[PDB]
Design a protein around this ligand. Structure first.
Ligand code: NA
Ligand code: NA
Ligand code: ZN
Ligand code: ZN
Ligand code: ZN
Ligand code: ZN
Ligand code: ZN
Ligand code: ZN
Ligand code: ZN
Ligand code: ZN
Ligand code: ZN
Length: 260
DNA sequence: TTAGCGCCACCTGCTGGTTAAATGTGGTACTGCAC
DNA sequence: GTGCAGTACCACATTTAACCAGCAGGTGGCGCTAA
């Protein structure tokens, strides 16, 4: 039961080899064998093996059910959870199960904690929680475009999407449509079409029970509902101080406020 | 002693489905004015 | 009062990007063995 103990820390190990290796990890901090490619070194030979494999790209073990070959056995074991499911880790609050420990840690941090430090965009004012989400934001909004992208409503050309969106947000209080015969302007195409119809005098809309024609659909609907609906009675608003009748609402107030 | 192996975690990073905020559409009242 | 013309609400349908769980690559720590 742990014959050996580390003098400089609290760890106790059964064998001399295990305690020595623990001393290598935390106390000796030596680098006898490093990689032939870079300056990285390790304590165990298998760590240098997998580092060399990452340098070269060798995948020893292949998945039984899929076409994935892993450089390490633990990678294959974790991959097997894709086919088997079997989410080991469980949240202690919402009791949700997750396949990887990091997934559970991120879930608990971002779903059951209020004050969590967040990342700030180096180029814009947006604030994001996850660094991966920040990378997506940078790669989408802040990416550079060689060919550029013209503004939707002007001849301005931008290379960063964030700049393009910020420019296009300045055109949301503008009447692009302008009549060629007068100074009238509007924001929706239907209004411009109606104005040009009034300019030309065209009345495309026609009543189906009379000879009358209209320049707008709403006008024809109101005429039909008035002069072709026997069971219709107009709304009459009565002054509360004198009693005389008024049809439109605003006129009734115009009389009631000045009535005696 | 010592390399090998197995397990486990930690750290980092990418990626599609989900969803909620933002935004564009169009039906339908709603007034100003000329008659 | 009313019809025409232009405007104003606003419920609704897209649009878009953060949210989030699902994944994989590189490294650090430990417990035994057989070699
Ligand atoms: Na409109
Ligand atoms: Na996924
Ligand atoms: Zn120690
Ligand atoms: Zn190396
Ligand atoms: Zn598989
Ligand atoms: Zn949870
Ligand atoms: Zn940004
Ligand atoms: Zn513009
Ligand atoms: Zn005009
Ligand atoms: Zn009619
Ligand atoms: Zn009155």
């Amino acid at each position: 039961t742990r014959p050996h103990k580390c003098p400089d820390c609290d760890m106790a190990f059964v064998t001399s080899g295990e305690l020595v290796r623990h001393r290598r990890y935390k106390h000796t901090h030596e680098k006898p064998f490093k990689c032939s490619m870079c300056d990285y070194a390790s304590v165990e030979v298998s760590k240098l093996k997998r580092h060399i494999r990452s340098h070269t790209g060798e995948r020893p073990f292949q998945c039984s059910l899929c076409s994935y070959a892993s450089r390490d056995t633990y990678k294959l074991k974790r991959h097997m959870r894709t086919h088997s499911g079997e989410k080991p880790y469980e949240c202690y609050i919402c009791h949700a199960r997750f396949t990887q420990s990091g997934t559970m840690k991120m879930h608990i941090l971002q779903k059951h904690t209020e004050n969590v430090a967040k990342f700030h965009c180096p180029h814009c004012d947006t604030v994001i929680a996850r660094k991966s989400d920040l990378g997506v934001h940078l790669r989408k909004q802040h990416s550079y475009i060689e060919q550029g992208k013209k503004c939707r409503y002007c001849d301005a050309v931008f290379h960063e999407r964030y700049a393009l969106i910020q420019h296009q947000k300045s055109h949301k209080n503008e009447k692009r449509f302008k009549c060629d015969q007068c100074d009238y302007a509007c924001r929706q195409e239907r209004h411009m079409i109606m104005h040009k119809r009034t300019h030309t005098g065209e009345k495309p809309y026609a009543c189906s029970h009379c000879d009358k024609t209209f320049r707008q659909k709403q006008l024809l609907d109101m005429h039909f509902k008035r002069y072709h609906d026997p069971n219709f009675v107009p709304a009459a608003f009565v002054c509360s101080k004198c009693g005389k009748t008024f049809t439109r609402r605003n006129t009734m107030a115009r009389h009631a406020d000045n009535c005696a």
